[PDB]
Amino acid sequence: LDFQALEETTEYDGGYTRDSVLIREFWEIVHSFTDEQKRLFLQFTTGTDRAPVGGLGKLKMIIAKNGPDTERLPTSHTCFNVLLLPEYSSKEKLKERLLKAITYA
Amino acid sequence: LDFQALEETTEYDGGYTRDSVLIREFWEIVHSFTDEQKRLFLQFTTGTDRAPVGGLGKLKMIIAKNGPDTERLPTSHTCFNVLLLPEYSSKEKLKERLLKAITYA
Ligand SMILES: [Ca+2]
Ligand SMILES: [Ca+2]
C-alpha cells in the first residue's frame, strides 16, 4: 500500500492545503501507521481495506476542514459524486452540452 | 426515480448555490428529462442507472462550477471520497481522534 501515492493525489477543501500545519501532521501520522492502522484508515475513508487497481494514487480523496479544535471525531463520506458543470451562457446550451455528455459516453 | 428528492439533497461548489441561474436551469432540464435521459444522467454521475436504497434522496451529489461558458462538456467523478477533519490543536490530539474514529467503527 503506497500512501506516498495517496498523499500526492489528495485534494483539500475548507481552508486546508498541502502546506497546512494540520495536513503536514496528518501525513506524518499516516506514514507512521502500522499496516493494520493503514487498512482501518482505508476502510473508514473508502469503504474497503484494499487499494483500487493502480494503487492508492488512483483514489479520489479530499480532506476537508469542518471545524476548529473539538472533542468530536473525524467523519467521512465513502461514495461522494460530483458533476463538474461549466456556467454555460444559456439554458439551451446547458441542455445540449449535458445531453451530449451523458449520451455519448 | 424521484429527482425532486435528488434536487433537495444536492450540494454545490465552485460558486454555485441552489439560487444560481445555471442551477435553476439545470433542474428545469433534468425534471423535463425522459426516463431514458434520467437513467443516462444517473449512469454518468453515479456509475449506475439505478437509485440506491432509500431512493435518489440518499445519493451524495455535488454540482461544482469548473469554468465559465465553453464548448467543453461537463465531466464527473462517480466515486469521490471525503475525510472531514477538524483542525485539532496538536498532532497528539489529531492522532488520538483519528485512531479512535477508524478503530471503533
Ligand atoms: Ca501487521
Ligand atoms: Ca421511456
Side-chain angles (χ1 to χ4, degrees), chain A residues 11 16 28 62 64-67 69-72 74-78 80-89 91 93 97, chain B residues 11 16 28 62 64-67 69-72 74-78 80-89 91 93 97:
Chain A
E11 301 161 73
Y16 291 147
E28 288 168 7
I62 307 171
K65 180 175 166 178
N66 70 330
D69 181 52
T70 178
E71 298 315 300
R72 298 278 287 202
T75 48
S76 69
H77 301 296
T78 54
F80 228 101
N81 299 295
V82 63
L83 178 64
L84 298 159
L85 189 59
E87 195 164 47
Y88 300 111
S89 56
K91 177 176 175 184
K93 178 165 197 187
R97 297 277 186 278
Chain B
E11 301 161 73
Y16 291 147
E28 288 168 7
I62 307 171
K65 180 175 166 178
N66 70 330
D69 181 52
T70 178
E71 298 315 300
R72 298 278 287 202
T75 48
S76 69
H77 301 296
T78 54
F80 228 101
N81 299 295
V82 63
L83 178 64
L84 298 159
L85 189 59
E87 195 164 47
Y88 300 111
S89 56
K91 177 176 175 184
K93 178 165 197 187
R97 297 277 186 278

Tab-separated table of all heavy atoms in Angstrom, chain A residues 11 16 28 60 62 64-67 69-72 74-78 80-89 91 93 97, chain B residues 11 16 28 60 62 64-67 69-72 74-78 80-89 91 93 97, unseen atoms left out:
chain	number	residue	atom	x	y	z
A	11	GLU	N	-6.618	15.871	-2.507
A	11	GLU	CA	-7.106	17.256	-2.667
A	11	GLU	C	-7.627	17.768	-1.327
A	11	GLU	O	-7.873	16.958	-0.410
A	11	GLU	CB	-8.268	17.281	-3.676
A	11	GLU	CG	-7.911	16.755	-5.054
A	11	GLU	CD	-9.133	16.352	-5.884
A	11	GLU	OE1	-9.837	17.269	-6.348
A	11	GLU	OE2	-9.420	15.111	-5.973
A	16	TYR	N	-7.975	23.961	4.097
A	16	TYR	CA	-6.705	23.213	4.096
A	16	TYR	C	-6.012	23.303	2.735
A	16	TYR	O	-6.665	23.456	1.667
A	16	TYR	CB	-6.896	21.740	4.406
A	16	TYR	CG	-7.328	21.416	5.823
A	16	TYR	CD1	-8.162	20.329	6.087
A	16	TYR	CD2	-6.858	22.121	6.933
A	16	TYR	CE1	-8.514	19.974	7.372
A	16	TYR	CE2	-7.213	21.786	8.236
A	16	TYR	CZ	-8.065	20.723	8.457
A	16	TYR	OH	-8.446	20.460	9.730
A	28	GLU	N	2.329	12.893	8.524
A	28	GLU	CA	3.337	12.268	9.438
A	28	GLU	C	2.677	11.091	10.167
A	28	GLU	O	3.274	10.001	10.280
A	28	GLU	CB	3.852	13.295	10.422
A	28	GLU	CG	4.775	14.339	9.815
A	28	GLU	CD	5.097	15.541	10.688
A	28	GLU	OE1	4.705	15.520	11.878
A	28	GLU	OE2	5.668	16.532	10.163
A	60	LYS	N	-9.663	8.869	-5.479
A	60	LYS	CA	-10.039	10.301	-5.349
A	60	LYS	C	-10.366	10.536	-3.878
A	60	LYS	O	-11.278	9.924	-3.351
A	60	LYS	CB	-11.155	10.747	-6.299
A	62	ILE	N	-10.535	13.716	-0.881
A	62	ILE	CA	-10.489	15.102	-0.421
A	62	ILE	C	-10.391	15.081	1.107
A	62	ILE	O	-11.176	14.380	1.721
A	62	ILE	CB	-11.737	15.861	-0.884
A	62	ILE	CG1	-12.007	15.774	-2.362
A	62	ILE	CG2	-11.646	17.276	-0.414
A	62	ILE	CD1	-13.356	16.362	-2.723
A	64	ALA	N	-11.150	17.722	3.992
A	64	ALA	CA	-11.822	18.998	4.180
A	64	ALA	C	-11.892	19.388	5.646
A	64	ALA	O	-12.340	18.609	6.489
A	64	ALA	CB	-13.197	18.912	3.583
A	65	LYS	N	-11.507	20.625	5.935
A	65	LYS	CA	-11.661	21.178	7.295
A	65	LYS	C	-13.141	21.436	7.569
A	65	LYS	O	-13.749	22.154	6.815
A	65	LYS	CB	-10.893	22.497	7.422
A	65	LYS	CG	-11.010	23.129	8.809
A	65	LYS	CD	-10.150	24.359	8.923
A	65	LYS	CE	-10.563	25.127	10.156
A	65	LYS	NZ	-9.717	26.309	10.335
A	66	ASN	N	-13.649	20.852	8.651
A	66	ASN	CA	-15.065	21.013	9.005
A	66	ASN	C	-15.262	21.625	10.391
A	66	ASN	O	-16.418	21.650	10.879
A	66	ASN	CB	-15.846	19.718	8.839
A	66	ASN	CG	-15.477	18.676	9.877
A	66	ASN	OD1	-14.311	18.646	10.363
A	66	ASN	ND2	-16.437	17.815	10.207
A	67	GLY	N	-14.209	22.207	10.952
A	67	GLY	CA	-14.347	22.950	12.208
A	67	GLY	C	-12.981	23.162	12.819
A	67	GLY	O	-11.974	22.631	12.336
A	69	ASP	N	-10.604	23.185	16.585
A	69	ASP	CA	-10.322	22.154	17.606
A	69	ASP	C	-11.613	21.772	18.331
A	69	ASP	O	-12.458	22.654	18.618
A	69	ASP	CB	-9.317	22.698	18.609
A	69	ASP	CG	-8.962	21.678	19.657
A	69	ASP	OD1	-8.587	20.557	19.296
A	69	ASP	OD2	-9.089	22.052	20.842
A	70	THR	N	-11.785	20.487	18.594
A	70	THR	CA	-13.023	19.908	19.142
A	70	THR	C	-12.688	18.551	19.764
A	70	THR	O	-11.665	17.983	19.437
A	70	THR	CB	-14.070	19.783	18.008
A	70	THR	OG1	-15.254	19.183	18.538
A	70	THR	CG2	-13.608	18.894	16.874
A	71	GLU	N	-13.569	18.067	20.627
A	71	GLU	CA	-13.550	16.684	21.072
A	71	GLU	C	-14.217	15.759	20.058
A	71	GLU	O	-14.042	14.537	20.153
A	71	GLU	CB	-14.227	16.536	22.446
A	71	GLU	CG	-13.505	17.324	23.550
A	71	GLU	CD	-11.983	17.204	23.570
A	71	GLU	OE1	-11.501	16.056	23.730
A	71	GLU	OE2	-11.261	18.260	23.420
A	72	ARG	N	-14.945	16.289	19.098
A	72	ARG	CA	-15.655	15.446	18.132
A	72	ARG	C	-14.640	14.757	17.212
A	72	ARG	O	-13.550	15.279	16.976
A	72	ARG	CB	-16.626	16.298	17.315
A	72	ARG	CG	-17.709	16.969	18.157
A	72	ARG	CD	-18.890	16.046	18.488
A	72	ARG	NE	-19.682	15.878	17.269
A	72	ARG	CZ	-20.970	15.518	17.212
A	72	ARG	NH1	-21.625	15.264	18.318
A	72	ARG	NH2	-21.606	15.446	16.051
A	74	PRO	N	-13.279	12.847	13.583
A	74	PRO	CA	-13.416	12.976	12.142
A	74	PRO	C	-14.536	12.092	11.628
A	74	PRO	O	-14.866	11.101	12.234
A	74	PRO	CB	-12.087	12.515	11.556
A	74	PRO	CG	-11.150	12.316	12.714
A	74	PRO	CD	-11.998	12.246	13.966
A	75	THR	N	-15.079	12.497	10.485
A	75	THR	CA	-16.150	11.753	9.807
A	75	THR	C	-15.709	11.566	8.356
A	75	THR	O	-14.729	12.153	7.879
A	75	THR	CB	-17.499	12.448	9.984
A	75	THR	OG1	-17.353	13.823	9.680
A	75	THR	CG2	-17.991	12.294	11.396
A	76	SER	N	-16.455	10.758	7.650
A	76	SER	CA	-16.152	10.524	6.233
A	76	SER	C	-17.410	10.344	5.404
A	76	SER	O	-18.452	9.952	5.924
A	76	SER	CB	-15.265	9.339	6.067
A	76	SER	OG	-15.949	8.160	6.383
A	77	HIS	N	-17.280	10.530	4.101
A	77	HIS	CA	-18.283	10.031	3.124
A	77	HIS	C	-17.518	9.219	2.074
A	77	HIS	O	-16.531	9.718	1.513
A	77	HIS	CB	-19.054	11.190	2.480
A	77	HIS	CG	-19.780	12.057	3.443
A	77	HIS	ND1	-20.801	11.584	4.208
A	77	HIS	CD2	-19.683	13.394	3.692
A	77	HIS	CE1	-21.256	12.578	4.958
A	77	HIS	NE2	-20.610	13.698	4.623
A	78	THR	N	-17.878	7.931	1.929
A	78	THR	CA	-17.094	6.867	1.231
A	78	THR	C	-17.455	6.792	-0.260
A	78	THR	O	-16.715	6.115	-1.038
A	78	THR	CB	-17.357	5.474	1.825
A	78	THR	OG1	-18.764	5.221	1.824
A	78	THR	CG2	-16.814	5.304	3.227
A	80	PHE	N	-18.919	9.703	-2.545
A	80	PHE	CA	-19.366	11.036	-2.980
A	80	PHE	C	-19.343	11.082	-4.506
A	80	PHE	O	-18.585	10.358	-5.182
A	80	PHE	CB	-18.505	12.131	-2.358
A	80	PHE	CG	-19.332	13.237	-1.768
A	80	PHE	CD1	-19.532	13.265	-0.401
A	80	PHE	CD2	-20.024	14.152	-2.553
A	80	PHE	CE1	-20.352	14.205	0.195
A	80	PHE	CE2	-20.827	15.105	-1.942
A	80	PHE	CZ	-20.962	15.142	-0.575
A	81	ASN	N	-20.195	11.916	-5.070
A	81	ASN	CA	-20.302	12.009	-6.539
A	81	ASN	C	-20.256	13.469	-6.889
A	81	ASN	O	-20.735	14.317	-6.117
A	81	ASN	CB	-21.615	11.466	-7.078
A	81	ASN	CG	-21.779	10.007	-6.750
A	81	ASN	OD1	-21.015	9.165	-7.235
A	81	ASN	ND2	-22.702	9.747	-5.840
A	82	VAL	N	-19.651	13.744	-8.018
A	82	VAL	CA	-19.514	15.184	-8.385
A	82	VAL	C	-19.755	15.347	-9.869
A	82	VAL	O	-19.209	14.611	-10.702
A	82	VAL	CB	-18.187	15.863	-7.990
A	82	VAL	CG1	-16.991	15.273	-8.651
A	82	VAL	CG2	-18.261	17.358	-8.242
A	83	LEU	N	-20.605	16.313	-10.153
A	83	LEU	CA	-20.846	16.767	-11.537
A	83	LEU	C	-20.111	18.106	-11.689
A	83	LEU	O	-20.398	19.023	-10.923
A	83	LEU	CB	-22.356	16.937	-11.779
A	83	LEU	CG	-22.685	17.441	-13.175
A	83	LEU	CD1	-22.279	16.461	-14.269
A	83	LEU	CD2	-24.167	17.761	-13.265
A	84	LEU	N	-19.185	18.188	-12.633
A	84	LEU	CA	-18.368	19.373	-12.922
A	84	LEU	C	-19.072	20.049	-14.086
A	84	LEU	O	-19.036	19.515	-15.201
A	84	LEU	CB	-16.930	18.952	-13.227
A	84	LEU	CG	-16.266	18.245	-12.046
A	84	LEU	CD1	-15.080	17.388	-12.417
A	84	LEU	CD2	-15.913	19.236	-10.951
A	85	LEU	N	-19.729	21.171	-13.802
A	85	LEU	CA	-20.636	21.811	-14.761
A	85	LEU	C	-20.236	23.243	-15.059
A	85	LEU	O	-20.338	24.121	-14.217
A	85	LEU	CB	-22.005	21.736	-14.122
A	85	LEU	CG	-23.151	22.141	-15.003
A	85	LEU	CD1	-23.219	21.269	-16.251
A	85	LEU	CD2	-24.456	22.047	-14.206
A	86	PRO	N	-19.717	23.504	-16.272
A	86	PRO	CA	-19.385	24.856	-16.634
A	86	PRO	C	-20.637	25.753	-16.651
A	86	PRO	O	-21.764	25.270	-16.871
A	86	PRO	CB	-18.782	24.737	-18.028
A	86	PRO	CG	-18.261	23.335	-18.073
A	86	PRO	CD	-19.286	22.534	-17.299
A	87	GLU	N	-20.426	27.053	-16.513
A	87	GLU	CA	-21.533	28.034	-16.429
A	87	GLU	C	-21.889	28.450	-17.867
A	87	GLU	O	-21.529	29.556	-18.293
A	87	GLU	CB	-21.148	29.175	-15.491
A	87	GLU	CG	-22.337	30.022	-15.065
A	87	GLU	CD	-22.039	30.896	-13.850
A	87	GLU	OE1	-20.965	31.555	-13.837
A	87	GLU	OE2	-22.906	30.933	-12.901
A	88	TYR	N	-22.546	27.560	-18.603
A	88	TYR	CA	-22.922	27.842	-19.999
A	88	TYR	C	-23.808	29.083	-20.089
A	88	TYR	O	-24.575	29.414	-19.142
A	88	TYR	CB	-23.647	26.634	-20.605
A	88	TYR	CG	-22.781	25.392	-20.605
A	88	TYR	CD1	-23.095	24.327	-19.774
A	88	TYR	CD2	-21.648	25.301	-21.400
A	88	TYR	CE1	-22.308	23.194	-19.773
A	88	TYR	CE2	-20.845	24.168	-21.389
A	88	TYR	CZ	-21.194	23.097	-20.592
A	88	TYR	OH	-20.427	21.975	-20.571
A	89	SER	N	-23.778	29.694	-21.278
A	89	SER	CA	-24.356	31.042	-21.472
A	89	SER	C	-25.880	31.009	-21.592
A	89	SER	O	-26.506	32.107	-21.513
A	89	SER	CB	-23.763	31.711	-22.696
A	89	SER	OG	-23.953	30.887	-23.834
A	91	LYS	N	-29.703	28.360	-21.131
A	91	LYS	CA	-30.381	27.089	-20.785
A	91	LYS	C	-30.253	26.135	-21.975
A	91	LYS	O	-29.979	24.932	-21.755
A	91	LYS	CB	-31.816	27.360	-20.350
A	91	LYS	CG	-32.614	26.116	-20.045
A	91	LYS	CD	-33.996	26.354	-19.529
A	91	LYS	CE	-34.774	25.075	-19.355
A	91	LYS	NZ	-36.172	25.333	-18.934
A	93	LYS	N	-28.035	25.922	-24.321
A	93	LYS	CA	-26.644	25.404	-24.419
A	93	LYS	C	-26.392	24.370	-23.321
A	93	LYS	O	-25.787	23.339	-23.585
A	93	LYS	CB	-25.661	26.579	-24.351
A	93	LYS	CG	-24.193	26.201	-24.395
A	93	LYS	CD	-23.265	27.374	-24.700
A	93	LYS	CE	-21.894	26.899	-25.148
A	93	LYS	NZ	-20.903	27.977	-25.289
A	97	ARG	N	-25.199	20.539	-24.059
A	97	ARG	CA	-23.890	20.092	-23.540
A	97	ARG	C	-24.093	18.906	-22.592
A	97	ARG	O	-23.364	17.883	-22.673
A	97	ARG	CB	-23.253	21.236	-22.760
A	97	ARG	CG	-22.928	22.487	-23.566
A	97	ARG	CD	-21.618	22.373	-24.283
A	97	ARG	NE	-21.234	23.605	-24.946
A	97	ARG	CZ	-21.684	23.993	-26.129
A	97	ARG	NH1	-22.581	23.287	-26.784
A	97	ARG	NH2	-21.277	25.141	-26.605
B	11	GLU	N	-25.700	19.198	-3.136
B	11	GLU	CA	-24.800	20.245	-2.610
B	11	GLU	C	-24.078	20.923	-3.772
B	11	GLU	O	-24.062	20.374	-4.893
B	11	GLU	CB	-23.743	19.606	-1.694
B	11	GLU	CG	-24.316	18.852	-0.509
B	11	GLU	CD	-23.330	17.858	0.112
B	11	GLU	OE1	-22.392	18.326	0.784
B	11	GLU	OE2	-23.464	16.620	-0.171
B	16	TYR	N	-21.490	27.949	-7.212
B	16	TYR	CA	-22.931	27.683	-7.363
B	16	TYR	C	-23.624	27.599	-6.001
B	16	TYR	O	-23.008	27.221	-4.967
B	16	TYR	CB	-23.210	26.380	-8.090
B	16	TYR	CG	-22.838	26.353	-9.560
B	16	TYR	CD1	-22.387	25.179	-10.163
B	16	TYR	CD2	-23.001	27.458	-10.398
B	16	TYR	CE1	-22.107	25.112	-11.512
B	16	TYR	CE2	-22.711	27.413	-11.758
B	16	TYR	CZ	-22.238	26.243	-12.314
B	16	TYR	OH	-21.900	26.246	-13.626
B	28	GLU	N	-34.584	22.546	-14.111
B	28	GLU	CA	-35.694	22.568	-15.116
B	28	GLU	C	-35.415	21.500	-16.182
B	28	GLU	O	-36.325	20.741	-16.573
B	28	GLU	CB	-35.803	23.941	-15.740
B	28	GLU	CG	-36.369	25.008	-14.816
B	28	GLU	CD	-36.243	26.446	-15.292
B	28	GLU	OE1	-35.821	26.641	-16.456
B	28	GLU	OE2	-36.489	27.375	-14.479
B	60	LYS	N	-25.222	11.049	-2.438
B	60	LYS	CA	-24.399	12.258	-2.172
B	60	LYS	C	-23.943	12.784	-3.529
B	60	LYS	O	-23.253	12.089	-4.252
B	60	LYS	CB	-23.246	12.029	-1.189
B	62	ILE	N	-22.613	16.456	-5.497
B	62	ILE	CA	-22.187	17.852	-5.539
B	62	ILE	C	-22.213	18.302	-7.003
B	62	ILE	O	-21.667	17.591	-7.829
B	62	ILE	CB	-20.785	18.003	-4.940
B	62	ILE	CG1	-20.630	17.416	-3.563
B	62	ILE	CG2	-20.393	19.443	-4.981
B	62	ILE	CD1	-19.182	17.408	-3.115
B	64	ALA	N	-20.504	21.264	-9.047
B	64	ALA	CA	-19.448	22.252	-8.895
B	64	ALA	C	-19.186	23.001	-10.190
B	64	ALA	O	-18.973	22.394	-11.241
B	64	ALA	CB	-18.206	21.562	-8.414
B	65	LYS	N	-19.137	24.324	-10.095
B	65	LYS	CA	-18.747	25.162	-11.246
B	65	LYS	C	-17.252	24.997	-11.507
B	65	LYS	O	-16.482	25.233	-10.608
B	65	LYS	CB	-19.042	26.636	-10.954
B	65	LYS	CG	-18.661	27.565	-12.106
B	65	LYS	CD	-19.071	28.985	-11.823
B	65	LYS	CE	-18.374	29.897	-12.803
B	65	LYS	NZ	-18.784	31.288	-12.596
B	66	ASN	N	-16.907	24.614	-12.733
B	66	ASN	CA	-15.500	24.404	-13.094
B	66	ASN	C	-15.050	25.288	-14.256
B	66	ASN	O	-13.925	25.078	-14.772
B	66	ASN	CB	-15.187	22.936	-13.343
B	66	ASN	CG	-15.822	22.411	-14.616
B	66	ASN	OD1	-16.909	22.899	-15.034
B	66	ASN	ND2	-15.176	21.419	-15.224
B	67	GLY	N	-15.830	26.313	-14.575
B	67	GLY	CA	-15.398	27.298	-15.572
B	67	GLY	C	-16.592	28.105	-16.030
B	67	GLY	O	-17.738	27.812	-15.671
B	69	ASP	N	-18.650	29.967	-19.513
B	69	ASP	CA	-19.199	29.419	-20.772
B	69	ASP	C	-18.067	28.865	-21.637
B	69	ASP	O	-16.970	29.471	-21.701
B	69	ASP	CB	-19.926	30.521	-21.528
B	69	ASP	CG	-20.540	30.014	-22.805
B	69	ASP	OD1	-21.273	29.020	-22.762
B	69	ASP	OD2	-20.241	30.649	-23.838
B	70	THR	N	-18.306	27.725	-22.264
B	70	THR	CA	-17.296	26.960	-23.014
B	70	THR	C	-18.019	26.021	-23.981
B	70	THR	O	-19.186	25.745	-23.781
B	70	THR	CB	-16.401	26.186	-22.015
B	70	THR	OG1	-15.450	25.414	-22.751
B	70	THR	CG2	-17.180	25.208	-21.161
B	71	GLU	N	-17.301	25.547	-24.988
B	71	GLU	CA	-17.743	24.432	-25.807
B	71	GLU	C	-17.460	23.092	-25.133
B	71	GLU	O	-18.015	22.073	-25.565
B	71	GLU	CB	-17.084	24.472	-27.198
B	71	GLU	CG	-17.460	25.731	-27.994
B	71	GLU	CD	-18.937	26.120	-27.974
B	71	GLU	OE1	-19.755	25.284	-28.432
B	71	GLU	OE2	-19.286	27.262	-27.494
B	72	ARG	N	-16.648	23.062	-24.099
B	72	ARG	CA	-16.295	21.796	-23.449
B	72	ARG	C	-17.521	21.238	-22.716
B	72	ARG	O	-18.395	21.994	-22.289
B	72	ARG	CB	-15.142	22.019	-22.471
B	72	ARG	CG	-13.861	22.516	-23.138
B	72	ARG	CD	-13.026	21.396	-23.774
B	72	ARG	NE	-12.390	20.642	-22.694
B	72	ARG	CZ	-11.291	19.884	-22.804
B	72	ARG	NH1	-10.701	19.760	-23.968
B	72	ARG	NH2	-10.770	19.283	-21.745
B	74	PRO	N	-19.599	18.917	-19.722
B	74	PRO	CA	-19.498	18.578	-18.312
B	74	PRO	C	-18.749	17.273	-18.128
B	74	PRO	O	-18.727	16.444	-19.006
B	74	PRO	CB	-20.931	18.424	-17.819
B	74	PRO	CG	-21.825	18.876	-18.939
B	74	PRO	CD	-20.985	18.898	-20.198
B	75	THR	N	-18.160	17.137	-16.944
B	75	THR	CA	-17.420	15.926	-16.559
B	75	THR	C	-17.968	15.485	-15.203
B	75	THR	O	-18.728	16.195	-14.531
B	75	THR	CB	-15.912	16.169	-16.595
B	75	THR	OG1	-15.622	17.370	-15.905
B	75	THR	CG2	-15.429	16.275	-18.014
B	76	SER	N	-17.557	14.314	-14.793
B	76	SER	CA	-17.987	13.796	-13.490
B	76	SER	C	-16.897	12.991	-12.808
B	76	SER	O	-16.012	12.449	-13.468
B	76	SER	CB	-19.216	12.965	-13.626
B	76	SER	OG	-18.934	11.770	-14.298
B	77	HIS	N	-17.022	12.829	-11.502
B	77	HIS	CA	-16.283	11.776	-10.758
B	77	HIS	C	-17.319	10.990	-9.948
B	77	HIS	O	-18.117	11.598	-9.220
B	77	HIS	CB	-15.211	12.389	-9.847
B	77	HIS	CG	-14.198	13.213	-10.557
B	77	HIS	ND1	-13.349	12.676	-11.474
B	77	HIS	CD2	-13.847	14.522	-10.409
B	77	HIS	CE1	-12.562	13.640	-11.930
B	77	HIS	NE2	-12.827	14.763	-11.257
B	78	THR	N	-17.400	9.670	-10.195
B	78	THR	CA	-18.518	8.763	-9.792
B	78	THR	C	-18.273	8.153	-8.404
B	78	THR	O	-19.228	7.559	-7.816
B	78	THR	CB	-18.689	7.591	-10.771
B	78	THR	OG1	-17.441	6.908	-10.910
B	78	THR	CG2	-19.189	8.013	-12.135
B	80	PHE	N	-16.061	9.655	-5.457
B	80	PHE	CA	-15.229	10.590	-4.680
B	80	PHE	C	-15.311	10.203	-3.206
B	80	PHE	O	-16.293	9.601	-2.729
B	80	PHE	CB	-15.660	12.034	-4.922
B	80	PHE	CG	-14.493	12.934	-5.211
B	80	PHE	CD1	-14.230	13.285	-6.521
B	80	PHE	CD2	-13.583	13.313	-4.231
B	80	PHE	CE1	-13.122	14.040	-6.862
B	80	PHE	CE2	-12.487	14.088	-4.583
B	80	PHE	CZ	-12.281	14.469	-5.887
B	81	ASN	N	-14.263	10.520	-2.469
B	81	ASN	CA	-14.204	10.150	-1.042
B	81	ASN	C	-13.793	11.384	-0.288
B	81	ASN	O	-13.030	12.214	-0.808
B	81	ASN	CB	-13.163	9.084	-0.745
B	81	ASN	CG	-13.462	7.808	-1.483
B	81	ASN	OD1	-14.480	7.156	-1.222
B	81	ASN	ND2	-12.630	7.535	-2.473
B	82	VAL	N	-14.332	11.504	0.900
B	82	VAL	CA	-14.014	12.743	1.670
B	82	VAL	C	-13.806	12.389	3.125
B	82	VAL	O	-14.599	11.662	3.739
B	82	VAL	CB	-15.030	13.896	1.550
B	82	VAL	CG1	-16.383	13.560	2.072
B	82	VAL	CG2	-14.491	15.149	2.214
B	83	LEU	N	-12.704	12.905	3.632
B	83	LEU	CA	-12.397	12.842	5.074
B	83	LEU	C	-12.668	14.244	5.638
B	83	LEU	O	-12.064	15.197	5.153
B	83	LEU	CB	-10.927	12.440	5.281
B	83	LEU	CG	-10.520	12.390	6.746
B	83	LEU	CD1	-11.273	11.324	7.532
B	83	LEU	CD2	-9.021	12.175	6.851
B	84	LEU	N	-13.562	14.347	6.610
B	84	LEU	CA	-13.967	15.598	7.264
B	84	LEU	C	-13.139	15.648	8.537
B	84	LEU	O	-13.400	14.859	9.453
B	84	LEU	CB	-15.477	15.594	7.506
B	84	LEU	CG	-16.275	15.507	6.206
B	84	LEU	CD1	-17.691	15.010	6.373
B	84	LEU	CD2	-16.237	16.828	5.457
B	85	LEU	N	-12.143	16.529	8.554
B	85	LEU	CA	-11.126	16.541	9.611
B	85	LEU	C	-11.057	17.877	10.324
B	85	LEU	O	-10.637	18.877	9.765
B	85	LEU	CB	-9.825	16.214	8.912
B	85	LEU	CG	-8.653	15.959	9.815
B	85	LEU	CD1	-8.930	14.794	10.757
B	85	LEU	CD2	-7.411	15.681	8.962
B	86	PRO	N	-11.522	17.934	11.585
B	86	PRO	CA	-11.417	19.158	12.334
B	86	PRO	C	-9.946	19.559	12.545
B	86	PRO	O	-9.047	18.697	12.564
B	86	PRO	CB	-12.094	18.846	13.663
B	86	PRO	CG	-13.040	17.736	13.331
B	86	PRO	CD	-12.292	16.904	12.312
B	87	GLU	N	-9.719	20.839	12.795
B	87	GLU	CA	-8.353	21.392	12.941
B	87	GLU	C	-7.951	21.242	14.419
B	87	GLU	O	-7.956	22.234	15.160
B	87	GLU	CB	-8.303	22.814	12.387
B	87	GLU	CG	-6.886	23.316	12.164
B	87	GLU	CD	-6.827	24.549	11.266
B	87	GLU	OE1	-7.628	25.493	11.493
B	87	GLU	OE2	-5.949	24.573	10.326
B	88	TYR	N	-7.653	20.016	14.838
B	88	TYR	CA	-7.274	19.751	16.236
B	88	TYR	C	-6.040	20.560	16.634
B	88	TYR	O	-5.163	20.881	15.785
B	88	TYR	CB	-7.007	18.254	16.436
B	88	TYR	CG	-8.226	17.413	16.124
B	88	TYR	CD1	-8.233	16.588	15.008
B	88	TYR	CD2	-9.366	17.469	16.913
B	88	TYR	CE1	-9.342	15.819	14.722
B	88	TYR	CE2	-10.489	16.708	16.618
B	88	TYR	CZ	-10.466	15.857	15.533
B	88	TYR	OH	-11.552	15.097	15.229
B	89	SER	N	-5.929	20.781	17.948
B	89	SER	CA	-4.958	21.756	18.490
B	89	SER	C	-3.533	21.201	18.522
B	89	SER	O	-2.584	22.013	18.730
B	89	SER	CB	-5.363	22.201	19.882
B	89	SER	OG	-5.503	21.072	20.726
B	91	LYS	N	-0.751	17.709	17.140
B	91	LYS	CA	-0.503	16.443	16.413
B	91	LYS	C	-0.989	15.283	17.285
B	91	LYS	O	-1.626	14.348	16.744
B	91	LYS	CB	0.962	16.348	16.003
B	91	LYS	CG	1.331	15.056	15.318
B	91	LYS	CD	2.739	14.972	14.826
B	91	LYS	CE	3.070	13.618	14.256
B	91	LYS	NZ	4.495	13.520	13.859
B	93	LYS	N	-3.268	15.135	19.576
B	93	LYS	CA	-4.755	15.089	19.591
B	93	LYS	C	-5.273	14.551	18.256
B	93	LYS	O	-6.191	13.739	18.243
B	93	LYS	CB	-5.302	16.485	19.908
B	93	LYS	CG	-6.814	16.605	19.914
B	93	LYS	CD	-7.328	17.875	20.585
B	93	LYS	CE	-8.799	17.761	20.945
B	93	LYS	NZ	-9.395	19.013	21.436
B	97	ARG	N	-7.673	11.267	17.926
B	97	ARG	CA	-9.028	11.434	17.365
B	97	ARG	C	-9.173	10.568	16.109
B	97	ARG	O	-10.196	9.857	15.930
B	97	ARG	CB	-9.224	12.894	16.976
B	97	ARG	CG	-9.167	13.898	18.121
B	97	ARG	CD	-10.477	14.012	18.838
B	97	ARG	NE	-10.475	15.059	19.842
B	97	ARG	CZ	-9.981	14.926	21.064
B	97	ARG	NH1	-9.393	13.812	21.446
B	97	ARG	NH2	-10.020	15.957	21.867
